Design a protein around this ligand. Structure first.
Ligand SMILES: C[C@@H]1COCCN1c1cc(C2([S@](C)(N)O)CC2)nc(-c2ccnc3[nH]ccc23)n1
Length: 137
């Protein structure tokens, strides 16, 4: 079912986050949203904040239906470090390793993720078609 497939897809992504990305050494700056009381300037600069806790919350809500949408938020972590800390900051080097281990692990699971992504997309289109046919009955 689309529910079993979304659960599987989300579990794979969550395991990539907790077992690989969160395990990158010294990755603590990216585990949670920046606290405005600690870094008030952060939210004057960073318009689209992102972090690994927020990604996990999004996974639990089944936000990500595709590898692309998942990686959109993953890359935001890196892009935001480039902007706030600079492209050569040690913070950005760490964010880069987080992104790289994400890519590496996605590649290991690309066969299964690609199939889940396709099957979720077909089931979603079918449910949309049926809902529209029912509303017009
Ligand atoms: C602003 C820096 C550099 O870019 C990425 C995130 N970064 C963070 C992130 C955090 C959080 S947190 C405690 N939830 O705000 C998410 C874990 N914290 C501090 C921080 C907080 C207080 N003093 C500090 N001194 C130096 C850094 C620092 N930096």
């Amino acid at each position: 079912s689309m529910d079993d497939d979304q659960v599987a897809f989300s579990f794979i992504l969550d395991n990539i986050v907790t077992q690989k990305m969160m395990a990158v050494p010294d990755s603590w700056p990216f585990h949670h949203p920046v606290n405005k009381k600690f870094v008030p300037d952060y939210y004057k600069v960073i318009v689209n904040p992102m972090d690994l806790e927020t990604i996990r919350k999004n996974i639990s809500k089944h936000k990500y239906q595709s590898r692309e949408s998942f990686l959109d938020d993953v890359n935001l972590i890196l892009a935001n470090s480039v902007k706030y800390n600079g492209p050569e900051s040690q913070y950005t080097k760490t964010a880069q390793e987080i992104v790289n281990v994400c890519y590496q692990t996605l590649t290991e699971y690309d066969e299964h993720l690609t199939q889940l992504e396709k099957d979720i997309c077909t089931a979603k289109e079918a449910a949309l078609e049926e809902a529209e046919l029912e509303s017009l009955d």
